[PDB]
Amino acid sequence: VGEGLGPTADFPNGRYQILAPLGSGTFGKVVSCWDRVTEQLVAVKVIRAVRKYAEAARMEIDILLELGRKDPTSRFHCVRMLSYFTHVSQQGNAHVCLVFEHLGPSLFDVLMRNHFRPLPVPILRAVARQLLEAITFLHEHNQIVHTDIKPENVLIVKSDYTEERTIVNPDVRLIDFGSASRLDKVSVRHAIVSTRHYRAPEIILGTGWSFACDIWSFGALLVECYTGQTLFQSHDDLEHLQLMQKLLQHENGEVIVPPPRPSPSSTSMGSQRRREALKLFRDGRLNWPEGIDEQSANSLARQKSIRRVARMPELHSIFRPEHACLLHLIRCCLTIDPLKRWRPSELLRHPFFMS
């Protein structure tokens, strides 16, 4: 902190003076910075010179250029990239740096600051609306899928506050386009995408994901805003799918069904994924709980999973009677079949947003 990034003729110690940390992750670090040229606060994302995260940073730049061209003022609530540069470190490491408008706390930071208590519904509604506007812009105006919708990637960059500090009138930015994919030509993909807790079932099952996987993540995000708590807390595919089945078991038509079995000759990424997913099934049904151990009749692992699934609520029981409208909205999102999920422009017409 206190160094500069992006040396220039006028500012050889760096145009962007590092002020404070903002966030970090496997991608690298985000720092609050003073732009010595325009004399503004900005946020700069510096990607670790690791190649994996650096080539992701370059596709992010490309998408953000197109989003910013179509929406300079972020009326559709995607983060605005102001600039980008390569910071050749004094060692020799070149870091890809993205310069963003001044940012703000994430939804995760908000939940954490409130001790993972429920977000009040009027704020939930305002955040949900702006995030759907962002997702509509991506899917329908740009044919881009984000794939990484989660609390850490939804920022409140501007916000009035009511006094501890409450949040009123949030101004949302969706961030992190380093995993976004253009789907205007290629309709379906099969790579594993999304962080575990927000990952749609079709990604696990190998049946092909598209725009709809973002609506699943969105639905899981909203439930977490309502309860304060991550909805799917498993890191194992078999148990994760069962938690989905349990949540939705009282929703008509909501069953986890296996992918079609691939030709044994088929070498594609999608076939490989479907073969793996089929190991989660026995005679066409999800092989839970028996598939958790299957090496011991009496199993500690199997017993833990049974308790975790028993603790998982049915979707309808999460919501207070007076919040039936939000439940109806989430039902249009948390559908196991991606073809049943609503488009974000349709979700924006839902009565939850008129009232």
- Feature table: binding site for Ca(2+): 148, 176
Query: Which residue ranges are tagged as binding site for Zn(2+)?
Result: 325
DSSP-assigned beta bridge partners for residue 21: 31
CB of 39 to Ca ion, least distance (A): 31
Give the total of residues touching Ca ion (CB under 5 A).
2
Nearest CB to Ca ion, comparing residues 26 and 38: 26
Whether omega before 120 lies within 30 degrees of 0, making that bond cis, reads: no
Footprint of Ca ion on 218-247 (CB under 5 A): none
Residues serving a catalytic function are 148
- The residue among 176 and 254 lying less far from Ca ion, judged by its C-beta, is 176
Nearest-approach distance from CB 165 to Ca ion, in angstroms: 27
Among residues 35, 60, 133, 148, the one that binds Ca ion under rule CB under 5 A: 148
Q: Which stretch binds Ca ion (CB under 5 A): 83-91, 147-155, 230-238, 291-299?
A: 147-155
- HSE-up of 243 (CA within 13 Å, CB side)? 24
Residue 162's DSSP bridge partners are 166
- CB-nearest residue to Ca ion: 148
Tell the smallest beta-carbon distance from residue 47 to Ca ion (Å): 12
Q: Which CB atom, from 148 or from 239, has the smaller least distance to Ca ion?
A: 148
Cα–Cα distance between 241 and 122 in angstroms, integer?
31
Identity of residue 166: T
Site for Ca ion in 174-203 (CB under 5 A): 176
79 phi/psi in degrees, rounded to 5? -55, 140
Stretch that binds Ca ion, among 65-73, 172-180, 288-296, 342-350 (CB under 5 A): 172-180
Task: Find, among 248, 239, 193, the residue nearest to 220 by Cα.
Answer: 248
Angle of CA points 192, 194, 206, to nearest 5°: 35
CB of 93 to Ca ion, least distance (A): 21
* Binding-site entries for ATP: 52
CB of 147 to Ca ion, least distance (A): 8
Stretch binding Ca ion (CB under 5 A), from 5-13, 141-149, 227-235, 251-259: 141-149
CA 131 to chain centre: 11
Distance of CA 101 to the CA centre of its chain: 20
**H or E element, residue 173:** strand 166-174
Most distant pair of Cα atoms in the chain: their distance: 72
Cβ-based nearer residue to Ca ion, 154 or 312 = 154
Nearest C-alpha neighbor of 114 from the set 187, 61, 66, 164? 164
* Chain positions contacting Ca ion, by CB under 5 A: 148, 176
